[PDB]
Amino acid sequence: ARYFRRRKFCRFTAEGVQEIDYKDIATLKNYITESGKIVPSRITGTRAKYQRQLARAIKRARYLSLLPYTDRHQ
Amino acid sequence: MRHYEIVFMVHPDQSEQVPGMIERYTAAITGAEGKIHRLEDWGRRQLAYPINKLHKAHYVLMNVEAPQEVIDELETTFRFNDAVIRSMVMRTKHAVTEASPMVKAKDERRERRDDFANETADDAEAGDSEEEEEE
Amino acid sequence: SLSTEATAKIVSEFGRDANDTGSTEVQVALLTAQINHLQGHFAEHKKDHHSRRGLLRMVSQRRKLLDYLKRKDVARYTRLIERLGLRR
Amino acid sequence: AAERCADAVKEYGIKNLEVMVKGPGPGRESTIRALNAAGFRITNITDVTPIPHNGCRPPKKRRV
């Protein structure tokens, strides 16, 4: 019609722009295997821009010791 | 100016000190005419992996606005200092920082992730301040 | 590129009171202030070749707009060169 | 190999085990199967295999 403008949330797996980055830990861990490493864009369905941006946020997090760098001994 | 998302964490046994470190830096930033967008302390946390023989550390998020010289001046202190275990500074020129989008990230932590525990009160208590009341 | 608040100052002084953007004197003054800023950068950064390419684009470009200006108003061109300190 | 080894530790009165698995060879899972059939209880079959994060250059073997 005219200016109601996107109430719904269901689309792409990334309809909101994920504007919390490396601080929402539970959002990150959805994209991390049990062996502690990032999964690919084809499996998660994240749009490619967001996916490159999520990878950066995961690496940021790993160096901050929020996320397992690897599962080694953990 | 420029906006800096500073995260740093401090080794447990000197952590009991830490509002005194924050009180030193925040006056060092605002005395250089910066502004503190926010100080959220994240508390004591259990590391993802040990960092040089240590299993837990206490995490502090400062969001500074400041000129380039000032962040540089903080890093030289952080470098020569036993107390900091590891430190990170992110970004530079986003005005998105000013409107404080981690006001929510602090609240989201409080509602579910961060809860009552003994270690994060131990870290708070050094700076205990009674300089308010009218005379 | 040059600082936004400095840029406001450059346009103000080498443009007319209409505050042009495109006028030839103003473009040459903007390039010049950027060449002088960059000339401080390539003191320390001797081996930066990919940014040096952009330098040679600014210098070449200025050189062309100077040709243009001298084909038009020779009074304005002789004035501009000395007010911005160009050559010897 | 596993059953022979199982004899050597009988002198230590061991009954329960955890096992670390290490490398790309064959025998990798088949050795575990021999340990459980030795009468040992196995707690985790933790594969540990050591993986460079890109790291040092491999030899280039089988060459042309």
Added chain:
Amino acid sequence: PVIKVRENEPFDVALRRFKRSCEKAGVLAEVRRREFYEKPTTERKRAKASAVKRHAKKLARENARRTRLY
């Protein structure tokens, strides 16, 4: 792997290929060769070829329908 987080007792149905994060089948690409630095242009940029194989199958259903292959 057999997997160490499934639940800890020996249950022998678990097929190790149908239980691998990554191990073997790419992971030891880094042993007994260095994949010569842009050898991958001819090893790995046969992505077009395997995307073609999927296109070919997706075509081949349709040509069999109009030709009546049975």
Added chain:
RNA sequence: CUUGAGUCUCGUAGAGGGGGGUAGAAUUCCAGGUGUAGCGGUGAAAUGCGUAGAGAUCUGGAGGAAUACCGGUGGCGAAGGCGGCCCCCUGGACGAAGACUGACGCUCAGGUGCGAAAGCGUGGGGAGCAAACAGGAUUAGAUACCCUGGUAGUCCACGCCGUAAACGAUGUCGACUUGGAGGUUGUGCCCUUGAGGCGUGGCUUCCGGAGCUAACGCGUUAAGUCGACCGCCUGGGGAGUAC
């Protein structure tokens, strides 16, 4: 005069460049604990390492290169080229609207400039790999393949000849000429209500039509229709050599 070309504010994506720091996994080495006879290697083997306690295994330190997964037909780049993370300096492109100058354009002999690579000088560095070199094997030889070691080198800093299958084997810029299916990034409109519908620019990739090409094949990113300017070719060998 303003469509060309240039210019301003607001924004966006990216391994574009340079300088500094920093983190984990791993090969190695030294140190120490446990522990016993092979370990390592291949087609099989031997040289090697091992009963002076190896290999494996636990701890701690040292060092140097690379920087898993993410990574994709992906992306950026004048090209060669560039993938951890963090900051500092900085280049270029693209958009959306407004405005501004007014042909400032295109091409380029000579010319100056910019290198993958190995090579190269002087200084540092040396963990892995590894020409030369050695030893073992196969062979009728076997200066080779394969295996055990290993030097220069690769790595940094600064300087030198500028080579390449330096490529799309396709010179630049510009106009024009049916589409489909996909990547990717800005962006106008939608109860934005089906990882959905309509609108517009940027690059990018597989397919194919008219046409062209000897043919393969190209095909709106041309090898189609043309414009401008530059390079270059004139049978094979000899020769990209001699002087």
